Design a protein around this ligand. Sequence first.
Ligand SMILES: CCCCCCCCO[C@@H]1O[C@H](CO)[C@@H](O)[C@H](O)[C@H]1O
Ligand SMILES: CCCCCCCCO[C@@H]1O[C@H](CO)[C@@H](O)[C@H](O)[C@H]1O
Ligand SMILES: CCCCCCCCO[C@@H]1O[C@H](CO)[C@@H](O)[C@H](O)[C@H]1O
Ligand SMILES: CCCCCCCCO[C@@H]1O[C@H](CO)[C@@H](O)[C@H](O)[C@H]1O
Ligand SMILES: CCCCCCCCO[C@@H]1O[C@H](CO)[C@@H](O)[C@H](O)[C@H]1O
Ligand SMILES: CCCCCCCCO[C@@H]1O[C@H](CO)[C@@H](O)[C@H](O)[C@H]1O
Ligand SMILES: CCCCCCCCO[C@@H]1O[C@H](CO)[C@@H](O)[C@H](O)[C@H]1O
Ligand SMILES: CCCCCCCCO[C@@H]1O[C@H](CO)[C@@H](O)[C@H](O)[C@H]1O
Ligand SMILES: CCCCCCCCO[C@@H]1O[C@H](CO)[C@@H](O)[C@H](O)[C@H]1O
Ligand SMILES: CCCCCCCCO[C@@H]1O[C@H](CO)[C@@H](O)[C@H](O)[C@H]1O
Ligand SMILES: CCCCCCCCO[C@@H]1O[C@H](CO)[C@@H](O)[C@H](O)[C@H]1O
Ligand SMILES: CCCCCCCCO[C@@H]1O[C@H](CO)[C@@H](O)[C@H](O)[C@H]1O
Lengths: 309, 309, 309
Amino acid sequence: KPFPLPTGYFGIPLGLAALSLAWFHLENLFPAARMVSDVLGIVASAVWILFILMYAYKLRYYFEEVRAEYHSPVRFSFIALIPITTMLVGDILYRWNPLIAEVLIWIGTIGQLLFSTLRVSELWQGGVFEQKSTHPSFYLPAVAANFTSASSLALLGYHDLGYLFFGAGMIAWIIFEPVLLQHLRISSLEPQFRATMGIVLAPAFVCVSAYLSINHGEVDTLAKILWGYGFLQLFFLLRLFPWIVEKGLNIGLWAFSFGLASMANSATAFYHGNVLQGVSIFAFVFSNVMIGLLVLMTIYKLTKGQFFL
Amino acid sequence: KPFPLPTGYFGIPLGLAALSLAWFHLENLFPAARMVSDVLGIVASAVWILFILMYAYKLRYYFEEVRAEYHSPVRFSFIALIPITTMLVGDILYRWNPLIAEVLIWIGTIGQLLFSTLRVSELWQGGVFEQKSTHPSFYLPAVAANFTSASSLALLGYHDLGYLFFGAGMIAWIIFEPVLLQHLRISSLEPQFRATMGIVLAPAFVCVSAYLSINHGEVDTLAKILWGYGFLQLFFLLRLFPWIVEKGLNIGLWAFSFGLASMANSATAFYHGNVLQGVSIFAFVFSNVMIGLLVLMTIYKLTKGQFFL
Amino acid sequence: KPFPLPTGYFGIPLGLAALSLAWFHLENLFPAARMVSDVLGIVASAVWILFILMYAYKLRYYFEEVRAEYHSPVRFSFIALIPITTMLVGDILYRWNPLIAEVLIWIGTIGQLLFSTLRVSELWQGGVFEQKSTHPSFYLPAVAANFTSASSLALLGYHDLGYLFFGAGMIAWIIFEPVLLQHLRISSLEPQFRATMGIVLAPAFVCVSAYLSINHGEVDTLAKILWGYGFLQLFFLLRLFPWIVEKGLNIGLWAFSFGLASMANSATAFYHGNVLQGVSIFAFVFSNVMIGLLVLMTIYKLTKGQFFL
Ligand SMILES: CCCCCCCCO[C@@H]1O[C@H](CO)[C@@H](O)[C@H](O)[C@H]1O
Ligand SMILES: CCCCCCCCO[C@@H]1O[C@H](CO)[C@@H](O)[C@H](O)[C@H]1O
Ligand SMILES: CCCCCCCCO[C@@H]1O[C@H](CO)[C@@H](O)[C@H](O)[C@H]1O
Ligand SMILES: CCCCCCCCO[C@@H]1O[C@H](CO)[C@@H](O)[C@H](O)[C@H]1O
Ligand SMILES: CCCCCCCCO[C@@H]1O[C@H](CO)[C@@H](O)[C@H](O)[C@H]1O
Ligand SMILES: CCCCCCCCO[C@@H]1O[C@H](CO)[C@@H](O)[C@H](O)[C@H]1O
Ligand SMILES: CCCCCCCCO[C@@H]1O[C@H](CO)[C@@H](O)[C@H](O)[C@H]1O
Ligand SMILES: CCCCCCCCO[C@@H]1O[C@H](CO)[C@@H](O)[C@H](O)[C@H]1O
Ligand SMILES: CCCCCCCCO[C@@H]1O[C@H](CO)[C@@H](O)[C@H](O)[C@H]1O
Ligand SMILES: CCCCCCCCO[C@@H]1O[C@H](CO)[C@@H](O)[C@H](O)[C@H]1O
Ligand SMILES: CCCCCCCCO[C@@H]1O[C@H](CO)[C@@H](O)[C@H](O)[C@H]1O
Ligand SMILES: CCCCCCCCO[C@@H]1O[C@H](CO)[C@@H](O)[C@H](O)[C@H]1O
């Protein structure tokens, strides 16, 4: 029974793949962490394969739906999930096959850069994007895709090239967030989009995780600064959580998984660097519990014929 | 004759307490600086006690006025003056009683973080905050409170935790200022609020003062960068001063005292580091003269039954 | 046949002077680079002299046109080209006569700081600047003028003072760009102003070029970060180029020459530091070809009686 896969579902393998990598970084401190990493990584990779196959079907048989999402000044952003997750799967696979991993990383990096270059810039022509288009999802092509390239390139040994992507994402972040939070202040985000508030958790933690990958895990002043703003945003989003889910818990809450998983990844580096170890443990446990809850609610929905379109 | 204390009056002990700390930092260069520091610090602490007592009375007998200021998307910010000044008084008291100082610092830090977490985030629900709510006072809970925690925690020996607060404030600053200055460009701030333009002086100087506390007074590239933007803002506000006071000099001009006092504090570190010593001397003298003028106009108003509500 | 010189034409000597300085920095790697630098520098200096003479005539005989551009919340910005180019000519002249160079640098630095202090701040009074005034040209007095002072002061040996100007420009940039790109998203820039999109290329490259002047050419994390965002903007502007010139190629395209020339200058430092040498070569060649095309189209227009007003 054919159906067009909602692009946002790539957030599921994305969150799982990022959490696999966080656990990978604990292996030398806690050897059993590698088994947990490998299991999360295989599950994320499997889900990614499936979703890539489903999306290839969407492109072949439901192309006009993709074209409409592509030209939308709001919905285009979710497409960036595709190359982001491709890169994270490459990072996972690198532990087993660096050749295949490097192919996936380059495909994702070229694909996300071509994507942004075509669409993010086109917004600057005016008249299509409106004030009401100012959504957290914009972080995906503008910010998160660049941080993911930064960290993946560093994994491959291209640290200086990674810094270029890092810079592109960090400055893009700082340049978009002001107008986003002002818009949220003035305009009440409608319930159907509120789960995407979870993406507001992402920038500072995805940023510091990419930074720590490129700088060999040196926890310095910048990294601490980023963690500070990251936790501020976490506390804000926690207070806002009842309003976020005013209309009920739903699968869109996977939007939080990117920032959660990056908070866990960055915590491993803070722990290794003997900076705020107690905070690190808390951060790492919290993010795992929250993602575990997402998995449980996803298994629940799956067994009730919900989930898919 | 009972009366409800206007919350903004906490700006007076705030400015004096911050100026006490600036002088404290000169003691080893100029021993008489410690007497000047102690006198400013005792006066600020005394005024703070009084104002805290008056505000406790406001909470008990005029609670609905506090509730209205609290839920206002503009007036809520002045409440942040309370924990900020509590921390600065703790910093002063630390020279005499580190135990009491540490209690005040933690009360202020927890109180300001709870405050922001409850109210600054709630703004993101939309529909209450309006474009016309975009006032410089927002810096108080969003930016200045975090910088004050950063510096106070560093005083207590919690440097890495201080960096987290520093980061939260520095990034929050950069994220709010763009929309503030655009709003000021487009919308003429009404005279009754114009004294609060003085708060625009604060961010860069309060930032660098907190930075220098946490990094042991090392005047590095970041510190110089911050000073640069700080002076730009000073020059802009000086040119704007006749327009700020178009409707007359008033007590609201204490709004400038936070940035002035922080400019004096940061100047002590620049002087100790042998960076721009001539600029430092100028900055330190200027801020003291300006705060001295504020004291004189406050003594004036006090002797004319003006001042209080 | 008297005529009032359009202020924007100072962009021509500006671009050429900045490109002279980029080549100057290659002299020790490639000795023939000094001849290319000297020729570009003499041509830029000659054009500057002429344009300064023409503008002195405009001030004497067409003063009301200058007054109107000065008080315009949009057109005032182009006036900043005057002190910027004065400084860059001083930087060029320094190779032959450091005394004269230092006079020009100080005149430009004092002039641009007085200019911004008078006009950029005055915008904050509200009611004159409108949303539709949010143009890329604002970068000139707010950002580029400060970076140029930073680098020129460093040339003169005033590195710490240069850092203050650097800071003023870097933070000003970060504070304006968010509202600029949001405005471009929402409002289609009209064709007659679209050439000024070229100024969007400038900030990151002019920033890193100034940074590298003040920090003795040390290619560090900040410099790489800036280059990253710089290239992102380049790719975006390249995709947008057909829309920029939808109504035809014109002399306003000299607006791109500031970012192009700074990209070439920064590339010399990256090359000297053995960072991304291949990218550096590409950047340096690209910018030269693009500026060469501008020269060719300018010679073309000159020989067809176009060009001047
Ligand atoms: C995975 C993301 C892919 C997004 C699909 C790109 C949409 C391209 O867009 C369309 O392509 C058509 C021709 O094929 C043109 O005729 C249309 O003008 C254009 O709208
Ligand atoms: C995620 C992998 C990369 C996506 C490539 C999408 C190809 C889009 O294709 C191009 O997109 C432009 C959009 O601005 C359209 O104007 C063009 O019509 C179209 O050819
Ligand atoms: C908007 C966020 C910007 C913050 C970045 C500035 C932090 C840079 O901090 C720098 O880091 C080095 C390593 O710890 C320190 O040694 C330097 O002395 C310090 O200036
Ligand atoms: C990001 C957090 C990941 C690391 C979690 C490890 C939790 C271990 O716990 C710690 O183990 C130590 C020695 O191994 C003990 O010294 C500590 O006191 C104990 O807290
Ligand atoms: C020092 C700052 C304190 C701010 C006062 C908090 C305002 C709380 O708010 C009020 O509390 C009431 C119950 O007591 C509720 O009934 C109301 O719904 C709520 O408006
Ligand atoms: C400065 C010291 C800390 C202030 C604590 C204030 C307690 C506020 O109280 C809570 O505030 C919420 C506001 O968003 C309200 O919604 C709640 O009704 C109220 O209980
Ligand atoms: C928006 C403001 C951001 C500016 C922060 C960047 C400045 C960081 O500057 C860094 O500081 C170190 C200490 O001086 C230097 O040694 C580093 O080499 C330099 O990259
Ligand atoms: C932030 C500024 C605080 C310090 C102010 C000190 C002013 C002292 O003045 C300085 O004293 C020096 C030696 O002590 C002399 O060498 C200097 O030339 C003189 O300028
Ligand atoms: C090179 C830039 C110079 C800009 C010209 C400044 C415009 C000054 O402005 C004008 O000056 C007049 C008196 O001379 C006043 O009468 C006017 O009120 C004022 O508009
Ligand atoms: C580029 C060299 C420096 C330019 C100096 C311009 C002098 C402007 O002159 C002043 O400008 C003010 C504008 O805000 C006006 O209000 C004043 O009327 C005018 O005297
Ligand atoms: C918005 C842009 C802000 C980015 C500035 C932060 C970069 C500062 O980076 C700092 O630079 C030093 C020199 O390479 C490093 O050694 C420090 O360890 C690093 O923290
Ligand atoms: C910003 C770029 C400026 C420098 C351009 C130089 C191009 C020279 O080319 C380089 O010359 C080298 C030795 O001199 C050879 O080793 C290289 O392989 C070759 O690429």
